[PDB]
Amino acid sequence: EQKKMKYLENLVGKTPMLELIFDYKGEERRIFVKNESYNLTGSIKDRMAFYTLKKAYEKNEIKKGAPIVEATSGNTGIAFSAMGAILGHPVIIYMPDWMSEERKSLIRSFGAKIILVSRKEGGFLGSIEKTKEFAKNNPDTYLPSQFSNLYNSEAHYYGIGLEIVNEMKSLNLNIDGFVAGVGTGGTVMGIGKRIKENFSNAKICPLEPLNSPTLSTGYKVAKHRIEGISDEFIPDLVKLDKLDNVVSVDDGDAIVMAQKLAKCGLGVGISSGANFIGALMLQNKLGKDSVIVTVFPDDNKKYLSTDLMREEKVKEDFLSKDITLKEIKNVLRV
């Protein structure tokens, strides 16, 4: 069983680190990005689901057969569904009734059971509250509580974090900076802890959609298209008085940016375009030659009837418009 937990680490992590070179009005810059599609269900939330349940078993927090229950329509639902099944747990996912058939289908394909929450019945906030309710009534239940559970960010401190840190040292470079958009805060907290232990002067910045500057303002919640991040509150996991300044990207700018990365061979999700632009924002402010790291949480295959496959009206302040990708200068993997 520690044999099982040991070998299954092999279905996650160890993803490519790419050096991307581009032209930014028009001087040549570069970003380093980890590509997280190279995982069991194609996102970074595989590293997190696996770890959450490995540690959970280690501390008797979950028993064989217990129901795993969470609120998402995104990769967390997917990651937990597939590892739940691998480890033999039932999985229940709670989500807003308005999710697309596309999403529901995927989560469902892994055995997980779908309970839709009306508008009304609380909506997204509803679904979170409905998970807690289920667990009061089924005490058996294991809740990942993805927005507050420390096991999430630890996942990234021990996993993608170590990886990032080493891949960069291996090019004899320091990390001057890291940016990641925040859904749960796990990535930016976990990786950011790890980067700071090795690169004491780096800047760890959390990313928010400029359309919904929840993190930078403390209250504002608005419609945005960057899936995976910036839900309608500040997750407990994320700790702003301990991070550097917040970066903010228009969802339009991001979409476009992800359009361009695909066009140069990297099919990614909208969040990945946001990170990229964020990473350049952070570069603009630390120095044209700083090393900036970010992540590409998933690939484009799920986003195929989203604004990602449509012309975006460009706007004056977008950075995407000034950016031209030249090449992939390097790929590491270890």
Ligand X SMILES: *Cc1c(COP(=O)(O)O)cnc(C)c1O
Where do contacts with ligand X occur on this chain (CB under 6 A)?
Answer: 43, 45, 74-75, 181-187, 227-229, 269, 271, 297-298
- Which entry of Cl ion, ligand X, a second copy, none binds 245, CB below 5 to 8 A by partner kind? Cl ion
Task: Tell me the CB-side half-sphere exposure of residue 256, using CA atoms within 13 A.
Answer: 19
x-marked contacts with a second copy along 39-78 as a string, rule CB under 8 A: xxxx------------------------------------
CB atoms within 10 A of CB 105: 11
The distance between the two most distant Cα atoms of the chain, rounded to a whole number of Å, is: 60
- Which entry of a second copy, ligand X, Cl ion, none binds 102, CB below 5 to 8 A by partner kind? a second copy
Q: Does 14 contact a second copy by CB under 8 A?
A: yes
- In order of 37, 68, 116, 170, the CA distances from 76 in angstroms are 14, 12, 16, 31
Residue 316's contacts (CB-CB under 8 Å, 6 or more residues apart) are none
Q: Which helix (H) or strand (E) holds 150?
A: helix 150-158
Phi then psi dihedrals of residue 155, to 5 deg:
-45, -50
- Which entry of Cl ion, ligand X, a second copy, none binds 269, CB below 5 to 8 A by partner kind? ligand X
- Which entry of a second copy, Cl ion, ligand X, none binds 182, CB below 5 to 8 A by partner kind? ligand X
Shortest distance, position 297 Cβ to a second copy, whole Å = 15
Q: Compare residues 245 and 284 and give the one whose CB is closer to Cl ion.
A: 245
Please report the beta strands in the chain, taking only residues with DSSP state E, as ranges in sequence order.
Answer: 17-24, 27-35, 68-71, 91-96, 113-117, 177-181, 203-209, 247-249, 292-296, 323-332
Q: Compare residues 7 and 219 and give the one whose CB is closer to a second copy.
A: 7
Query: Which residue type, as a one-letter code, is found at position 106?
Result: L
Q: Does 85 contact a second copy by CB under 8 A?
A: yes
Using DSSP's 3-state secondary structure scheme, residue 318 falls into: coil
Neighbour order of strands in the sheet with 113-117:
68-71, 91-96, 113-117
The secondary structure of 32-46 as a DSSP string is EEEETTSSTTSSTHH
Q: Compare residues 9 and 244 and give the one whose CB is closer to Cl ion.
A: 244
Q: Which residues are annotated as a binding site for pyridoxal 5'-phosphate?
A: 75, 183-185, 187, 271
End-to-end CA distance of the chain: give it in Å, rounded: 26
Shortest distance, position 153 Cβ to ligand X, whole Å = 8
Q: Compare residues 247 and 262 and give the one whose CB is closer to a second copy.
A: 262
- Which entry of ligand X, a second copy, Cl ion, none binds 220, CB below 5 to 8 A by partner kind? none
Return the structure tokens found at 212.
Answer: 């919904």
Phi then psi dihedrals of residue 21, to 5 deg:
-110, 140
Rule CB under 5 A: choose which of 174, 198, 216, 245 binds Cl ion. Answer: 245
Q: Compare residues 84 and 183 and give the one whose CB is closer to a second copy.
A: 84
Which residues partner with 324 through β-bridges?
Answer: 23
**From the centroid of its chain, how far is CA 202?**
20
- Which entry of Cl ion, ligand X, a second copy, none binds 302, CB below 5 to 8 A by partner kind? a second copy
Stretch that binds Cl ion, among 29-37, 44-52, 145-153, 236-244 (CB under 5 A): 236-244
Contact residues toward Cl ion (CB under 5 A) are 244-245
Contact residues toward a second copy (CB under 8 A) are 7-8, 10-11, 14, 16, 35, 37-42, 82-86, 88, 102, 105-106, 108-111, 259, 262-267, 299-302, 304, 308-309, 327-328, 330-333
